Amino acid sequence: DKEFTKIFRRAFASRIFPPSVIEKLGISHVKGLLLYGPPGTGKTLIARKIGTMLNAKEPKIVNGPEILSKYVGSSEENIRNLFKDAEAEYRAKGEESSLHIIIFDELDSVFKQGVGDNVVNQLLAKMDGVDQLNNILVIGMTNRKDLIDSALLRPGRFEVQVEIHLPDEKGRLQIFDIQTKKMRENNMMSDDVNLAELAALTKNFSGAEIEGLVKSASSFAINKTVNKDIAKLKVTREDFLNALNDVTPAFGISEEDLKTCVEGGMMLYSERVNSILKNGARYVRQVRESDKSRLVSLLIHGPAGSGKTALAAEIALKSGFPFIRLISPNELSGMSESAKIAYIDNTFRDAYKSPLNILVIDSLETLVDWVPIGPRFSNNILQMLKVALKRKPPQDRRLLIMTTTSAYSVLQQMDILSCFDNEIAVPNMTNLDELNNVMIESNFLDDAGRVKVINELSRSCPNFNVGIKKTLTNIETARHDEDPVNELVELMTQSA
Amino acid sequence: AVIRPDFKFEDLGVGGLDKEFTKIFRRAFASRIFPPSVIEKLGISHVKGLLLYGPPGTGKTLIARKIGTMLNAKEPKIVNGPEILSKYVGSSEENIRNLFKDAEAEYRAKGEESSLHIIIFDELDSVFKQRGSRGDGTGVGDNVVNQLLAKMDGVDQLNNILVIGMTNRKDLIDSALLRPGRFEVQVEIHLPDEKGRLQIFDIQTKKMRENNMMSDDVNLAELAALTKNFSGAEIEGLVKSASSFAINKTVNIGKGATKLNTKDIAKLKVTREDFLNALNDVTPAFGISEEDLKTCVEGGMMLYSERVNSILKNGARYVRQVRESDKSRLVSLLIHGPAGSGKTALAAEIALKSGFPFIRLISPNELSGMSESAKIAYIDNTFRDAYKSPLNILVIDSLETLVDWVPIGPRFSNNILQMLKVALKRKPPQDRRLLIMTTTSAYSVLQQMDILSCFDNEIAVPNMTNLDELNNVMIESNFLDDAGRVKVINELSRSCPNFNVGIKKTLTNIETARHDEDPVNELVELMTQSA
Numbered sequence A: 001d002k003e004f005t006k007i008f009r010r011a012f013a014s015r016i017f018p019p020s021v022i023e024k025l026g027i028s029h030v031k032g033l034l035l036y037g038p039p040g041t042g043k044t045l046i047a048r049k050i051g052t053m054l055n056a057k058e059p060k061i062v063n064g065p066e067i068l069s070k071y072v073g074s075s076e077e078n079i080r081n082l083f084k085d086a087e088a089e090y091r092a093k094g095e096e097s098s099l100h101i102i103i104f105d106e107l108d109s110v111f112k113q114g115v116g117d118n119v120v121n122q123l124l125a126k127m128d129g130v131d132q133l134n135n136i137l138v139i140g141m142t143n144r145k146d147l148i149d150s151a152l153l154r155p156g157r158f159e160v161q162v163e164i165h166l167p168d169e170k171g172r173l174q175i176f177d178i179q180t181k182k183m184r185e186n187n188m189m190s191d192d193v194n195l196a197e198l199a200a201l202t203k204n205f206s207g208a209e210i211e212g213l214v215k216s217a218s219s220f221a222i223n224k225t226v227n228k229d230i231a232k233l234k235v236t237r238e239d240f241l242n243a244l245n246d247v248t249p250a251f252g253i254s255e256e257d258l259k260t261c262v263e264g265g266m267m268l269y270s271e272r273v274n275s276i277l278k279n280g281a282r283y284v285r286q287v288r289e290s291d292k293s294r295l296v297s298l299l300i301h302g303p304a305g306s307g308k309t310a311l312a313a314e315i316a317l318k319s320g321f322p323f324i325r326l327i328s329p330n331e332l333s334g335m336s337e338s339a340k341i342a343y344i345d346n347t348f349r350d351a352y353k354s355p356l357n358i359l360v361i362d363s364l365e366t367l368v369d370w371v372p373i374g375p376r377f378s379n380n381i382l383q384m385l386k387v388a389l390k391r392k393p394p395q396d397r398r399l400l401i402m403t404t405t406s407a408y409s410v411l412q413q414m415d416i417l418s419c420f421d422n423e424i425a426v427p428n429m430t431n432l433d434e435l436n437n438v439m440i441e442s443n444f445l446d447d448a449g450r451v452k453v454i455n456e457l458s459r460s461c462p463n464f465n466v467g468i469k470k471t472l473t474n475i476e477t478a479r480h481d482e483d484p485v486n487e488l489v490e491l492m493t494q495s496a
Numbered sequence B: 001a002v003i004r005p006d007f008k009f010e011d012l013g014v015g016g017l018d019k020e021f022t023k024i025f026r027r028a029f030a031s032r033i034f035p036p037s038v039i040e041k042l043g044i045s046h047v048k049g050l051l052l053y054g055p056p057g058t059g060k061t062l063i064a065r066k067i068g069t070m071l072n073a074k075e076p077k078i079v080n081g082p083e084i085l086s087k088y089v090g091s092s093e094e095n096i097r098n099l100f101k102d103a104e105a106e107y108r109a110k111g112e113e114s115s116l117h118i119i120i121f122d123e124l125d126s127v128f129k130q131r132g133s134r135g136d137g138t139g140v141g142d143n144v145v146n147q148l149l150a151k152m153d154g155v156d157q158l159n160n161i162l163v164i165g166m167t168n169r170k171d172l173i174d175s176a177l178l179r180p181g182r183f184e185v186q187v188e189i190h191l192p193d194e195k196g197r198l199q200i201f202d203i204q205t206k207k208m209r210e211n212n213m214m215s216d217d218v219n220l221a222e223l224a225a226l227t228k229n230f231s232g233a234e235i236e237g238l239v240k241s242a243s244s245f246a247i248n249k250t251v252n253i254g255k256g257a258t259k260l261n262t263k264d265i266a267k268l269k270v271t272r273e274d275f276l277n278a279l280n281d282v283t284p285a286f287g288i289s290e291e292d293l294k295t296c297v298e299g300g301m302m303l304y305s306e307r308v309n310s311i312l313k314n315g316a317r318y319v320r321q322v323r324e325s326d327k328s329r330l331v332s333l334l335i336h337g338p339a340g341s342g343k344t345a346l347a348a349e350i351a352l353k354s355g356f357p358f359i360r361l362i363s364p365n366e367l368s369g370m371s372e373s374a375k376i377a378y379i380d381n382t383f384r385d386a387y388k389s390p391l392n393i394l395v396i397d398s399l400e401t402l403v404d405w406v407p408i409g410p411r412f413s414n415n416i417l418q419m420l421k422v423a424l425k426r427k428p429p430q431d432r433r434l435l436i437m438t439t440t441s442a443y444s445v446l447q448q449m450d451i452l453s454c455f456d457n458e459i460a461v462p463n464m465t466n467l468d469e470l471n472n473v474m475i476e477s478n479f480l481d482d483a484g485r486v487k488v489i490n491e492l493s494r495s496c497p498n499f500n501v502g503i504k505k506t507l508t509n510i511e512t513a514r515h516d517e518d519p520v521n522e523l524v525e526l527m528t529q530s531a
């Protein structure tokens, strides 16, 4: 609706005025409008509806690829022939000519940077200069904006750019109702099926995909019958659930990546965990509330393997903000440097389009390509990050940044520590009490073994000092060989 | 109607691809089983386009050939790709829109009662390439796509046509035809599994076994086991190649004249060794692995000491763990020790005994000669491949050499190192498991790299030192007689009791002493200098 208001208010206001005033002042009316967006947004639908809603002349619909002509010079003949009606109508009357609209589906197909050049020549010739036809509106629609010929991308031509987006939640439910009507009405639908959950499953689907899913879900019911009881042909939930495997989108999401990081779960083996969580909650409310603190930076540092990614991910999931994202070395693997810089800069720029945002950075030093014998590292990306972490967002938008590291000293060498506002230390557990909590939580052994393990450990290793991750993997591997204590204690004593 | 009442698919040649047959039947002809009234009542349209594709020689042409006779279908119209084109202007286009008249006439004639007309385009990619190729020439290579596209999308309500297009390379197809309403369903045909392999052998050897022309000795199960990566075409080639051997025993081609033993013509019979010779003749074209690991342990084991046994037991323990638990989806192990002690053979042996579906090794041998980017890409593709099968074992050989370490700079390739560092910590996709074994000889260097933190457990392989183990390996190698093996050890006991060599050097010295002078004066001499 916002685009609907913008295009109407700004572009289509000058036609409203009495023609003599326009003729006399010399105000020049906007000629070119570019609708763009991903496939399936319905650019053709909006292009059709714009003509009808403005009470304009009947649109001339022509396909982009169909412009290609067999005969030499006939493509130019067609292009010039397109304008004859509008030219003659303006000649007869002038300012009183009605609004002619021409839509060229898939403009980029033929308008790339030699039929495809002579068409551009003819269009540009008829379009500007000798002609002052303000009664013609040409609407260009393309899925790929970068392919547009640069000869047309200039002021005066396609001044106004408007974008489009896929079907959101309610609209998807409504279209689902539209397709399902015929099948639901005829009492061949089991009441067990809920349409809203099928929307909840289909997040990145376009209408054609929806039709495909409908056919496949009906199809499993088809198969159930065929290896005269046709009355019992009913479409059930299970067919819909099964048919989801066939169709596939072309989208991507990283919210899942933040949910898998905490797969191992929390254990609250110590109070300091709760203290850290409290501090994180305090900082998120602080960003939420204060209108001046528009940028907050936090460091999470500690011994390797103590467990730092999971904590930040948990805090971020607890925040409940609209926009959440993670940057990790995993995504960047295999890329060249010039690509990694651009990827990082993208991930920063896309975060400035929402009132409240949280970003998490994983294993900073690993991104920086650090190795100590040289010491060797990539300076460019380091600089990129250093600049980026001090950028204030645009007005009225707020960021919360957490980065995790394990090489505090190296960062100290780099003098980058001035970038940050506050540090949090996460020490690994050292007291056998926490081992007991972890042990009961993991239901490793009965009470007796869990009492004997502590006794055994007390007489060999008082200061325990191992990361939680190691403890978990040690428990898992000790589960199999010899569940009794005669494995486990030895293993930790080796890993002490 | 749409399938013959007398049919069960058991009789047909196609075997080993049964899931694909059910998918095609369910998604293609299912909607044309009921009376028409139901479909409109349900508001479902019919499917129009099909695509089949796979590597060369997988059986697609066999399907396309037999389906017409299979399902009581109107004789499908077969046109190979490059014949649609013609010399004269407009001839190709009219040729394309010359196929659809009969079905369309029947459609106007008889509405929805019209029977099903099937036309199959062998070799779809030949003419329907990308329609933005460019070239500034005769445009007949584009308007054909437009003609088919017009007659297939703007069909004017023709709903009784199914086109089946077969190809070997989807990528070359013009993208304009891969969209809903136009070749919606795509079916992949991949290489057969083992059971389908046996099916194919059985189908091929039917007529053979019926006419008592095969010896009872032959065992199909063994053959199916042997042919690791053979497609159906390669199997047929194997069959006839094995036959040629039996054929070439009575007729002695070239040598002598034509001597046909008319009696043995009736006793012609194939035997197992002929099949073995045939296996040696034909080779597959896919390969991947399962040979490099076997050759990596060619020298075999000797079990000269308990240490070998203990290490093997530990490896068995670990493979059991990764096989059983579902929470442990990734395990990494290091094998380190003195140079030449013998590390690679042990890991290969463990992997071979594991018997998992999926195994490969990475060695400097393969990567030789490539540019850095190529090496990065190669490793990445190998890893990405490993993330596929449910269970996976991967072996990494001589890590230091993969990273190009030389101690004078010290110079090394950082990119490869850091790529490996990130990669060895990557948990595979959901519900997949992976087991990594890496071997090295320069522990301290790795420690300086500070990359020691992504290894769950480390295994030492001390070289042998006690003269007993030397006697064991020597008796196994059969270097000399009994008295010789005794006297040499008695001499070595006092010549140099303290002893540190390894394993490889020992075998080398044994062979050299065998060649020149298997007396003491060579073997003991060299053994003494080496230690």
Ligand SMILES: Nc1ncnc2c1ncn2[C@@H]1O[C@H](COP(=O)(O)OP(=O)(O)OP(=O)(O)O)[C@@H](O)[C@H]1O
Pocket (backbone or CB within 6 Å): A262, A263, A264, A265, A266, A267, A268, A269, A273, A304, A305, A306, A307, A308, A309, A310, A311, A363, A406, A468, A469
């Ligand atoms: N309070 C806690 N603090 C840290 N880890 C915890 C806590 N409670 C539970 N865990 C568990 O500790 C495990 C070990 O941490 P994790 O697997 O994230 O390794 P890590 O230390 O982040 O790795 P890295 O060495 O790269 O920093 C987590 O998988 C998580 O399930």
Ligand SMILES: Nc1ncnc2c1ncn2[C@@H]1O[C@H](COP(=O)(O)OP(=O)(O)OP(=O)(O)O)[C@@H](O)[C@H]1O
Pocket (backbone or CB within 6 Å): B297, B298, B299, B300, B301, B302, B303, B304, B308, B338, B339, B340, B341, B342, B343, B344, B345, B346, B441, B503, B504
């Ligand atoms: N128990 C054993 N342990 C190791 N090798 C054995 C054993 N029994 C027999 N062998 C033989 O010893 C040889 C070991 O050589 P291998 O190539 O593994 O040495 P390596 O140390 O890996 O080589 P490099 O020094 O180049 O790294 C093989 O021929 C193997 O068959």
Ligand SMILES: Nc1ncnc2c1ncn2[C@@H]1O[C@H](COP(=O)(O)OP(=O)(O)O)[C@@H](O)[C@H]1O
Pocket (backbone or CB within 6 Å): B013, B014, B015, B016, B017, B055, B056, B057, B058, B059, B060, B061, B062, B200, B231, B232, B233, B236
């Ligand atoms: N189930 C099968 N799978 C693969 N090939 C088979 C099978 N049964 C028989 N064959 C033999 O393999 C060949 C089929 O190859 P074909 O499909 O023509 O390869 P292409 O993929 O190049 O079309 C025929 O010679 C046929 O006799």
